[PDB]
Amino acid sequence: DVSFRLSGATSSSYGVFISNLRKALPNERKLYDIPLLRSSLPGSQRYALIHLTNYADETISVAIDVTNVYIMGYRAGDTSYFFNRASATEAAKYVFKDAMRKVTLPYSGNYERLQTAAGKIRENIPLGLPALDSAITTLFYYNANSAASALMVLIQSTSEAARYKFIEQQIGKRVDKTFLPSLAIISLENSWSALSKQIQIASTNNGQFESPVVLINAQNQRVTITNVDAGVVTSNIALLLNRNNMA
């Protein structure tokens, strides 16, 4: 388990939370000093709970699958909420077991469905610590008219932040303000599995990728990444999706 409290939060306390979250995920190996996530884990080891408290002291617990940092559902009070996907009915056999009511949300938790459900693309959804406070509030008083957008703020403030130092930093520096994520953030989010796959191939091919990954930079320039000396591998990506946990 890992916790983050919005009351009294600072850039620093967010960074501590995201480092603790990365640490919570099991890894036996590192490649280029980056933790390589496990490809399979027994149920009793597969989930971690992130407890989030907003400024108003209301708390939600978020269940994540530690092999892929995917959120499977959350609990607020006596009720649990899970994504509609097989992996989420599997998580429900292990977490939030003594919830009184269990609701299955109407979507897998993937972005193309959440953006359709929210009627907004990620670039137009505010992030930053105040946005995370508001997302905790909206999910705690669940309403289908508002939950998709809040879930995308949740996912980006936890999973994507844990996957990339750049996303962590950008969100954490907004302690009293909010901001729209640049194409750079959208591109890192989109590309996590492909970058992870190539980084593992590189470790068996002298640091060279077998297929390039195109990312968007700070100038909204499309850049082609082809090896482990690229800044995204040396100083940004912080977790690797195991090649045998995609296919």
Ligand SMILES: Nc1ncnc2[nH]cnc12
């Ligand atoms: N539920 C989820 N958890 C983590 N990363 C995601 N990216 C899209 N949906 C996600």
